[PDB]
Write a protein of this length. Structure first.
Length: 122
């Protein structure tokens, strides 16, 4: 122990601290940002709503929002809210299955629109 201080001594002797002062810098979806289109497994198109470590499972989990009802989640995984979407549109897929949708893959885009208000008089 630190034998040579005295005066000011706190109460910190817990027997559990895997990481507190130093935390390993580990990232996978650093290039991907929230609010962008992504292709799950290069087949299932959608939008990146979430991306990071979850509670139900370990590892990076990106909550892509499929334009069509193909997913099996609504943003909330076992109660844990991550993003907003239909009942079965949002799907959590690993980072490895996260790629940018080809520019030639959007004949018509006009979905996702819940936030709509007009407080002020425009």
């Amino acid at each position: 122990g630190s034998s040579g201080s005295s005066g000011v001594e706190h109460e910190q002797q817990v027997t559990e601290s895997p990481s507190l002062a130093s935390v390993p810098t580990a990232d996978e979806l650093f290039d991907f940002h929230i609010g962008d289109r992504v292709l799950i497994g290069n087949v299932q198109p959608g939008i990146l709503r979430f991306k990071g470590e979850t509670s139900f499972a370990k590892g990076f989990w990106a909550g892509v929002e499929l334009d069509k009802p193909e997913g099996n989640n609504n943003g909330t995984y076992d109660g844990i809210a991550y993003f907003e979407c239909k009942e079965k549109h949002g799907i959590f897929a690993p980072p490895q299955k996260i790629s940018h949708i080809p520019e030639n893959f959007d004949d018509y885009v006009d979905i996702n629109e819940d936030e709509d208000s007009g407080p002020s008089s425009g």
